[PDB]
Amino acid sequence: KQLKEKISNIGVDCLGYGSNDMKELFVVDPFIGKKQQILLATQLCRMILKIDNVIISGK
Amino acid sequence: MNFGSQTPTIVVLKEGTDASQGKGQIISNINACVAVQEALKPTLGPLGSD
What we know:
Distance between the termini of chain A: 55 Å
Oligomer: part of a larger assembly
Structural class of chain B: mainly alpha
Chain A: T-complex protein 1 subunit epsilon
Keywords: TRiC/CCT, phosducin-like protein, chaperone
Radius of gyration of chain B: 23 Å
Largest sheet of chain A: none
Entry title: yeast TRiC-plp2 complex at S5 closed TRiC state
Order of helices and strands of chain B: H
Organism of A: Saccharomyces cerevisiae
Largest sheet of chain B: none
Helix content of chain A: 25-40%
PDB class: chaperone
């Protein structure tokens, strides 16, 4: 659907409504909040992948 | 004349003091530096690892 139509506010309806268009379902999120999910994730995983030596001193 | 039954010999260095002669120790010192060197071997370069 999203490849066909350019309207980009259709997602997964979890409450079981008959229509997936989110204009009528009253759901809104901030841009700064959804952006930080990608930024803090992709910036952390760079650090996770760059570890080769892993030394853990037993307590 | 003697004070007692026997008299054990004195160790020159203190008991537990490690010491060694020959070319074995300097090779061990070089191998010790190479052991520390191998930890930082793949770290060198832009594509290195933390």
